[PDB]
Design a protein around this ligand. Structure first.
Ligand SMILES: Cn1ncc(C(=O)N2CCC2)c1C(=O)Nc1cccc(-c2nc3ccccc3o2)c1
Ligand SMILES: [Mg+2]
Ligand SMILES: [Zn+2]
Length: 313
Protein backbone atom coordinates (compact mmCIF):
# COMPACT_ATOMS: atom_id res chain seq x y z
CA UNK A 1 0.00 0.00 0.00
CA UNK A 2 2.90 2.38 0.91
CA UNK A 3 5.17 0.36 -1.53
CA UNK A 4 6.04 3.10 -4.11
CA UNK A 5 8.17 2.10 -7.15
CA UNK A 6 11.24 4.41 -7.63
CA UNK A 7 13.54 4.51 -10.69
CA UNK A 8 17.17 5.63 -10.76
CA UNK A 9 17.48 9.41 -11.31
CA UNK A 10 18.11 9.42 -15.12
CA UNK A 11 15.08 7.09 -15.71
CA UNK A 12 12.86 9.01 -13.17
CA UNK A 13 13.39 12.16 -15.35
CA UNK A 14 13.71 10.68 -18.87
CA UNK A 15 10.56 8.43 -18.48
CA UNK A 16 8.34 11.61 -18.56
CA UNK A 17 9.62 12.44 -22.09
CA UNK A 18 7.94 11.02 -25.25
CA UNK A 19 11.32 9.82 -26.71
CA UNK A 20 12.33 7.72 -23.66
CA UNK A 21 13.91 4.34 -24.56
CA UNK A 22 13.13 1.66 -21.87
CA UNK A 23 16.67 0.21 -22.30
CA UNK A 24 18.11 -3.31 -22.86
CA UNK A 25 17.56 -4.58 -19.25
CA UNK A 26 14.42 -6.80 -19.64
CA UNK A 27 14.11 -7.40 -15.85
CA UNK A 28 13.46 -3.62 -15.32
CA UNK A 29 10.55 -3.40 -17.85
CA UNK A 30 7.94 -4.71 -15.33
CA UNK A 31 8.93 -2.12 -12.67
CA UNK A 32 8.97 0.65 -15.36
CA UNK A 33 5.37 -0.36 -16.26
CA UNK A 34 4.08 -0.45 -12.61
CA UNK A 35 5.83 2.93 -12.06
CA UNK A 36 3.83 4.29 -15.05
CA UNK A 37 0.48 2.82 -13.79
CA UNK A 38 1.09 4.24 -10.23
CA UNK A 39 1.86 7.82 -11.54
CA UNK A 40 -0.80 7.75 -14.37
CA UNK A 41 -3.73 6.09 -12.51
CA UNK A 42 -2.86 6.06 -8.75
CA UNK A 43 -1.17 3.50 -6.39
CA UNK A 44 -4.77 2.33 -5.51
CA UNK A 45 -6.19 1.39 -8.98
CA UNK A 46 -4.67 -2.19 -9.02
CA UNK A 47 -3.74 -4.76 -6.31
CA UNK A 48 0.09 -5.00 -6.71
CA UNK A 49 0.08 -8.88 -6.27
CA UNK A 50 -2.52 -9.17 -9.13
CA UNK A 51 -0.82 -6.55 -11.39
CA UNK A 52 2.63 -8.25 -11.08
CA UNK A 53 1.09 -11.66 -11.90
CA UNK A 54 -0.88 -10.14 -14.83
CA UNK A 55 2.32 -8.46 -16.21
CA UNK A 56 4.38 -11.67 -15.96
CA UNK A 57 1.63 -13.75 -17.72
CA UNK A 58 1.37 -11.07 -20.46
CA UNK A 59 5.20 -11.19 -20.85
CA UNK A 60 5.16 -15.05 -21.10
CA UNK A 61 2.53 -14.76 -23.94
CA UNK A 62 4.71 -12.45 -26.14
CA UNK A 63 6.97 -14.57 -28.42
CA UNK A 64 10.74 -14.23 -29.14
CA UNK A 65 10.21 -12.38 -32.48
CA UNK A 66 12.51 -9.55 -33.62
CA UNK A 67 9.99 -6.63 -33.35
CA UNK A 68 6.46 -7.63 -32.09
CA UNK A 69 7.86 -8.74 -28.72
CA UNK A 70 7.64 -7.84 -25.00
CA UNK A 71 9.92 -4.75 -25.54
CA UNK A 72 7.42 -3.38 -28.20
CA UNK A 73 4.50 -3.87 -25.74
CA UNK A 74 6.28 -1.86 -22.98
CA UNK A 75 7.59 0.82 -25.43
CA UNK A 76 3.99 1.34 -26.73
CA UNK A 77 2.60 1.51 -23.13
CA UNK A 78 5.34 4.08 -22.24
CA UNK A 79 4.27 6.28 -25.24
CA UNK A 80 0.60 6.16 -24.00
CA UNK A 81 1.81 7.06 -20.45
CA UNK A 82 3.59 10.19 -21.86
CA UNK A 83 0.33 11.21 -23.68
CA UNK A 84 -1.88 10.67 -20.61
CA UNK A 85 0.60 12.54 -18.33
CA UNK A 86 0.69 15.56 -20.77
CA UNK A 87 -3.19 15.55 -21.08
CA UNK A 88 -3.98 14.97 -17.33
CA UNK A 89 -7.59 16.32 -17.20
CA UNK A 90 -8.90 15.00 -20.62
CA UNK A 91 -9.22 11.29 -19.58
CA UNK A 92 -11.45 9.43 -17.09
CA UNK A 93 -10.12 7.12 -14.29
CA UNK A 94 -11.21 4.05 -16.37
CA UNK A 95 -9.61 5.28 -19.65
CA UNK A 96 -6.24 5.67 -17.80
CA UNK A 97 -6.50 2.11 -16.27
CA UNK A 98 -7.73 0.58 -19.59
CA UNK A 99 -5.34 2.23 -22.09
CA UNK A 100 -1.98 1.31 -20.42
CA UNK A 101 -3.23 -2.32 -20.13
CA UNK A 102 -4.51 -2.14 -23.75
CA UNK A 103 -1.01 -1.04 -24.92
CA UNK A 104 0.78 -3.80 -22.94
CA UNK A 105 -1.64 -6.42 -24.37
CA UNK A 106 -2.04 -4.96 -27.90
CA UNK A 107 0.23 -7.52 -29.71
CA UNK A 108 -0.17 -10.57 -27.33
CA UNK A 109 0.96 -13.82 -29.07
CA UNK A 110 2.09 -12.06 -32.31
CA UNK A 111 4.05 -14.46 -34.57
CA UNK A 112 5.72 -11.64 -36.61
CA UNK A 113 3.34 -12.01 -39.64
CA UNK A 114 0.78 -9.54 -41.09
CA UNK A 115 -3.00 -10.21 -41.36
CA UNK A 116 -2.29 -10.56 -45.16
CA UNK A 117 0.13 -13.50 -44.68
CA UNK A 118 -2.35 -15.29 -42.34
CA UNK A 119 -5.03 -14.89 -45.12
CA UNK A 120 -2.77 -16.18 -47.94
CA UNK A 121 -1.46 -19.03 -45.71
CA UNK A 122 -5.12 -19.91 -44.82
CA UNK A 123 -4.29 -19.82 -41.05
CA UNK A 124 -7.09 -20.94 -38.65
CA UNK A 125 -7.12 -17.38 -37.12
CA UNK A 126 -8.05 -16.10 -40.68
CA UNK A 127 -11.20 -18.36 -40.65
CA UNK A 128 -12.16 -17.34 -37.05
CA UNK A 129 -11.56 -13.52 -37.62
CA UNK A 130 -12.04 -12.29 -41.24
CA UNK A 131 -10.88 -8.66 -40.60
CA UNK A 132 -8.31 -7.31 -38.08
CA UNK A 133 -7.30 -11.01 -37.69
CA UNK A 134 -4.29 -10.68 -35.34
CA UNK A 135 -5.97 -7.82 -33.42
CA UNK A 136 -9.14 -9.84 -32.51
CA UNK A 137 -6.70 -12.58 -31.36
CA UNK A 138 -4.66 -10.09 -29.22
CA UNK A 139 -7.92 -8.96 -27.56
CA UNK A 140 -8.95 -12.65 -27.18
CA UNK A 141 -5.56 -13.44 -25.50
CA UNK A 142 -6.05 -10.41 -23.18
CA UNK A 143 -9.46 -11.71 -21.88
CA UNK A 144 -7.92 -15.23 -21.42
CA UNK A 145 -5.08 -13.84 -19.23
CA UNK A 146 -7.64 -11.66 -17.30
CA UNK A 147 -9.67 -14.87 -16.51
CA UNK A 148 -6.66 -16.75 -15.01
CA UNK A 149 -6.93 -17.26 -11.20
CA UNK A 150 -5.42 -14.30 -9.27
CA UNK A 151 -5.03 -12.28 -12.56
CA UNK A 152 -8.26 -10.17 -12.49
CA UNK A 153 -6.71 -6.68 -12.00
CA UNK A 154 -10.24 -5.16 -12.48
CA UNK A 155 -11.84 -7.29 -9.64
CA UNK A 156 -12.99 -4.18 -7.61
CA UNK A 157 -14.85 -2.52 -10.58
CA UNK A 158 -18.71 -2.83 -10.79
CA UNK A 159 -20.26 -5.11 -13.47
CA UNK A 160 -20.89 -1.93 -15.61
CA UNK A 161 -17.40 -0.37 -14.97
CA UNK A 162 -15.84 -3.79 -15.82
CA UNK A 163 -17.80 -3.98 -19.17
CA UNK A 164 -16.77 -0.33 -19.92
CA UNK A 165 -13.00 -0.98 -19.32
CA UNK A 166 -13.01 -4.24 -21.45
CA UNK A 167 -14.85 -2.27 -24.21
CA UNK A 168 -12.21 0.55 -24.04
CA UNK A 169 -9.51 -2.20 -24.26
CA UNK A 170 -11.24 -4.03 -27.18
CA UNK A 171 -11.67 -0.86 -29.31
CA UNK A 172 -8.11 0.29 -28.36
CA UNK A 173 -6.56 -3.02 -29.56
CA UNK A 174 -8.68 -3.25 -32.76
CA UNK A 175 -7.57 0.34 -33.64
CA UNK A 176 -3.90 -0.86 -33.81
CA UNK A 177 -4.98 -2.49 -37.11
CA UNK A 178 -3.23 0.07 -39.39
CA UNK A 179 -5.78 -0.82 -42.18
CA UNK A 180 -8.39 0.96 -39.95
CA UNK A 181 -6.12 3.99 -39.16
CA UNK A 182 -6.53 5.71 -42.61
CA UNK A 183 -10.33 6.21 -42.42
CA UNK A 184 -10.17 6.93 -38.65
CA UNK A 185 -7.66 9.79 -39.18
CA UNK A 186 -9.55 11.14 -42.30
CA UNK A 187 -12.77 11.31 -40.20
CA UNK A 188 -10.94 12.99 -37.26
CA UNK A 189 -9.30 15.49 -39.71
CA UNK A 190 -12.79 16.39 -41.17
CA UNK A 191 -14.39 16.57 -37.65
CA UNK A 192 -11.56 18.86 -36.39
CA UNK A 193 -11.63 21.28 -39.47
CA UNK A 194 -15.50 21.64 -39.48
CA UNK A 195 -15.40 22.05 -35.64
CA UNK A 196 -17.86 19.13 -35.05
CA UNK A 197 -15.23 17.24 -32.89
CA UNK A 198 -16.88 16.76 -29.43
CA UNK A 199 -14.96 14.85 -26.68
CA UNK A 200 -18.32 14.28 -24.83
CA UNK A 201 -19.56 12.33 -27.92
CA UNK A 202 -18.50 8.72 -26.98
CA UNK A 203 -18.07 7.74 -30.72
CA UNK A 204 -15.74 10.82 -30.99
CA UNK A 205 -13.64 9.74 -27.95
CA UNK A 206 -13.40 6.21 -29.46
CA UNK A 207 -11.84 7.73 -32.64
CA UNK A 208 -9.41 9.93 -30.56
CA UNK A 209 -8.31 6.85 -28.48
CA UNK A 210 -7.88 4.96 -31.82
CA UNK A 211 -5.53 7.66 -33.15
CA UNK A 212 -3.55 7.66 -29.83
CA UNK A 213 -3.22 3.83 -30.14
CA UNK A 214 -1.88 4.24 -33.72
CA UNK A 215 0.42 7.05 -32.43
CA UNK A 216 1.82 4.88 -29.52
CA UNK A 217 2.07 1.79 -31.77
CA UNK A 218 4.18 3.73 -34.35
CA UNK A 219 6.26 5.52 -31.65
CA UNK A 220 9.66 4.05 -32.85
CA UNK A 221 9.52 6.84 -35.53
CA UNK A 222 9.42 9.45 -32.67
CA UNK A 223 12.64 8.32 -30.85
CA UNK A 224 16.15 9.76 -31.17
CA UNK A 225 17.64 8.77 -34.57
CA UNK A 226 19.90 5.93 -33.23
CA UNK A 227 16.86 4.20 -31.53
CA UNK A 228 14.70 4.76 -34.69
CA UNK A 229 17.42 3.48 -37.06
CA UNK A 230 18.11 0.33 -34.91
CA UNK A 231 14.38 -0.43 -34.37
CA UNK A 232 13.97 -0.30 -38.23
CA UNK A 233 16.42 -3.30 -38.47
CA UNK A 234 14.09 -5.33 -36.18
CA UNK A 235 10.96 -4.21 -38.12
CA UNK A 236 12.53 -5.28 -41.48
CA UNK A 237 13.87 -8.57 -39.95
CA UNK A 238 10.20 -9.58 -39.53
CA UNK A 239 9.11 -8.06 -42.88
CA UNK A 240 11.80 -9.99 -44.82
CA UNK A 241 10.96 -13.32 -43.02
CA UNK A 242 7.31 -12.77 -44.11
CA UNK A 243 8.62 -12.02 -47.64
CA UNK A 244 10.50 -15.37 -47.53
CA UNK A 245 7.24 -17.13 -46.43
CA UNK A 246 5.31 -15.37 -49.25
CA UNK A 247 7.89 -16.78 -51.80
CA UNK A 248 7.51 -20.26 -50.17
CA UNK A 249 3.73 -20.05 -50.95
CA UNK A 250 4.55 -19.11 -54.64
CA UNK A 251 3.74 -15.34 -54.22
CA UNK A 252 6.16 -12.44 -55.01
CA UNK A 253 6.06 -10.31 -51.84
CA UNK A 254 5.58 -6.51 -52.01
CA UNK A 255 9.07 -4.91 -52.10
CA UNK A 256 8.74 -3.79 -48.38
CA UNK A 257 9.00 -7.54 -47.49
CA UNK A 258 11.52 -8.59 -50.22
CA UNK A 259 15.05 -8.78 -48.71
CA UNK A 260 16.33 -8.58 -52.36
CA UNK A 261 15.05 -4.90 -52.44
CA UNK A 262 16.97 -3.99 -49.21
CA UNK A 263 18.51 -1.06 -51.23
CA UNK A 264 14.94 0.51 -51.45
CA UNK A 265 14.46 0.71 -47.59
CA UNK A 266 15.36 4.43 -47.20
CA UNK A 267 12.81 5.42 -49.96
CA UNK A 268 10.27 3.02 -48.29
CA UNK A 269 10.68 4.86 -44.94
CA UNK A 270 9.97 8.24 -46.72
CA UNK A 271 6.70 6.77 -48.13
CA UNK A 272 5.67 5.57 -44.65
CA UNK A 273 6.65 8.87 -42.88
CA UNK A 274 4.75 10.86 -45.61
CA UNK A 275 1.75 8.46 -46.02
CA UNK A 276 1.29 7.30 -42.34
CA UNK A 277 3.52 8.72 -39.56
CA UNK A 278 3.48 12.51 -40.34
CA UNK A 279 -0.33 12.62 -40.99
CA UNK A 280 -0.95 10.54 -37.79
CA UNK A 281 1.08 12.81 -35.40
CA UNK A 282 -0.16 15.98 -37.27
CA UNK A 283 -3.88 15.09 -36.67
CA UNK A 284 -2.98 13.96 -33.07
CA UNK A 285 -1.22 17.31 -32.24
CA UNK A 286 -4.28 19.26 -33.61
CA UNK A 287 -6.66 17.28 -31.32
CA UNK A 288 -4.19 17.12 -28.33
CA UNK A 289 -1.73 20.05 -28.48
CA UNK A 290 0.69 18.78 -25.77
CA UNK A 291 1.60 15.71 -28.00
CA UNK A 292 3.54 18.07 -30.38
CA UNK A 293 6.97 16.62 -29.39
CA UNK A 294 5.86 13.33 -31.15
CA UNK A 295 5.26 15.32 -34.42
CA UNK A 296 8.58 17.25 -34.08
CA UNK A 297 10.60 14.02 -33.36
CA UNK A 298 8.87 12.31 -36.34
CA UNK A 299 9.81 15.21 -38.70
CA UNK A 300 13.45 15.06 -37.44
CA UNK A 301 13.55 11.29 -38.27
CA UNK A 302 12.03 11.92 -41.79
CA UNK A 303 14.90 14.42 -42.35
CA UNK A 304 17.40 11.76 -41.11
CA UNK A 305 16.01 9.24 -43.72
CA UNK A 306 16.30 11.93 -46.47
CA UNK A 307 20.00 12.29 -45.41
CA UNK A 308 20.47 8.48 -45.74
CA UNK A 309 19.11 8.69 -49.36
CA UNK A 310 21.35 11.73 -50.28
CA UNK A 311 24.33 9.44 -49.34
CA UNK A 312 25.11 11.77 -46.30
CA UNK A 313 24.72 8.52 -44.17
C1 LIG B 1 8.89 2.21 -39.25
N1 LIG B 1 7.63 1.47 -39.03
N2 LIG B 1 7.00 1.31 -37.78
C2 LIG B 1 5.94 0.53 -37.91
C3 LIG B 1 5.84 0.17 -39.28
C4 LIG B 1 4.75 -0.70 -39.80
O1 LIG B 1 4.21 -0.41 -40.84
N3 LIG B 1 4.33 -1.81 -39.14
C5 LIG B 1 3.30 -2.85 -39.41
C6 LIG B 1 3.92 -3.76 -38.34
C7 LIG B 1 4.72 -2.51 -37.90
C8 LIG B 1 6.94 0.75 -39.97
C9 LIG B 1 7.29 0.76 -41.42
O2 LIG B 1 8.43 1.02 -41.77
N4 LIG B 1 6.28 0.62 -42.33
C10 LIG B 1 6.26 0.68 -43.76
C11 LIG B 1 5.01 1.05 -44.32
C12 LIG B 1 4.79 1.18 -45.69
C13 LIG B 1 5.85 0.94 -46.55
C14 LIG B 1 7.12 0.60 -46.04
C15 LIG B 1 8.17 0.27 -47.04
N5 LIG B 1 9.42 -0.06 -46.75
C16 LIG B 1 10.06 -0.40 -47.91
C17 LIG B 1 11.38 -0.78 -48.21
C18 LIG B 1 11.73 -1.07 -49.52
C19 LIG B 1 10.79 -0.95 -50.54
C20 LIG B 1 9.49 -0.57 -50.27
C21 LIG B 1 9.10 -0.29 -48.96
O3 LIG B 1 7.93 0.11 -48.38
C22 LIG B 1 7.35 0.45 -44.64
MG1 LIG C 1 -0.27 -5.27 -33.87
ZN1 LIG D 1 2.17 -3.05 -32.07
Amino acid sequence: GLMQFTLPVRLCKEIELFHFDIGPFENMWPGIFVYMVHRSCGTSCFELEKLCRFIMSVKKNYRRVPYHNWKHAVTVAHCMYAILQNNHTLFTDLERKGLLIACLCHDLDHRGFSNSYLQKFDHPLAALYSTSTMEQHHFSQTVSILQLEGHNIFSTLSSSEYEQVLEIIRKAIIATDLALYFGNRKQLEEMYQTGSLNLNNQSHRDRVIGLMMTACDLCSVTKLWPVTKLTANDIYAEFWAEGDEMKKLGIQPIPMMDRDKKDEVPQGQLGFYNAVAIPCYTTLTQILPPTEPLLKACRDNLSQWEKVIRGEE
